[PDB]
Amino acid sequence: MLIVPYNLPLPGGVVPRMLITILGTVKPNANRIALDFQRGNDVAFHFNPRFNENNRRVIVCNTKLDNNWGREERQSVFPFESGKPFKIQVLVEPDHFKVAVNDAHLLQYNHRVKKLNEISKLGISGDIDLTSASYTMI
Ligand SMILES: O=C1N[C@H](C(=O)O)CC2=C1S[C@H]1[C@@H](O2)O[C@H](CO)[C@H](O)[C@@H]1O[C@@H]1O[C@H](CO)[C@H](O)[C@H](O)[C@H]1O
Ligand SMILES: [Cl-]
């Protein structure tokens, strides 16, 4: 397994048609997963499955600018399950990140950070066994 937290450099940032694929397995009794697409200290796109927020499962997405979190975007469709293997695909499109889990579209997140070519790292963290993390241009 890859060591979590894991840093995947994104050379020259992201760009439309870049597809990022994360494969792993959720731990038993997991609490959280997080993908952090970072522009230096800023987080352009935070994708944060929460397994037990007041006994509900929710995916929180947000952006962190100058150490301040913005307005969350929340999705109640929750495809992850403790103990089970998953695939996350993040396709960069002109206006948003488009996320599919296990080959099913999940959500889109509009670009708040405009300098896509400066979003040059992806941090992967949380309660997973991480199998692989990679990108390709489609
Ligand atoms: O510790 C905290 N200090 C804040 C204070 O002291 O003002 C208040 C606050 C928490 S926790 C939790 C919860 O209240 O509700 C908030 C929205 O109302 C957030 O959901 C927040 O969680 C944070 O959300 C971020 C994404 O927005 C990241 O995921 C981050 O990792 C995570 O810590
Ligand atoms: Cl920007």
Curated annotation (Swiss-Prot):
Annotated compartments: Cytoplasm; Nucleus; Secreted
UniProt superkingdom: Eukaryota
Keyword Repeat assigned: yes
Keyword set includes Membrane: no
Annotated positions of the Phosphoserine modification: S76
Occurrences of domain Galectin (ranges): 6-136
Tissue: A major expression is found in the colonic epithelium. It is also abundant in the activated macrophages. Expressed in fetal membranes.
The protein's name: Galectin-3
Source organism (scientific name): Homo sapiens
Lineage: Eukaryota, Metazoa, Chordata, Craniata, Vertebrata
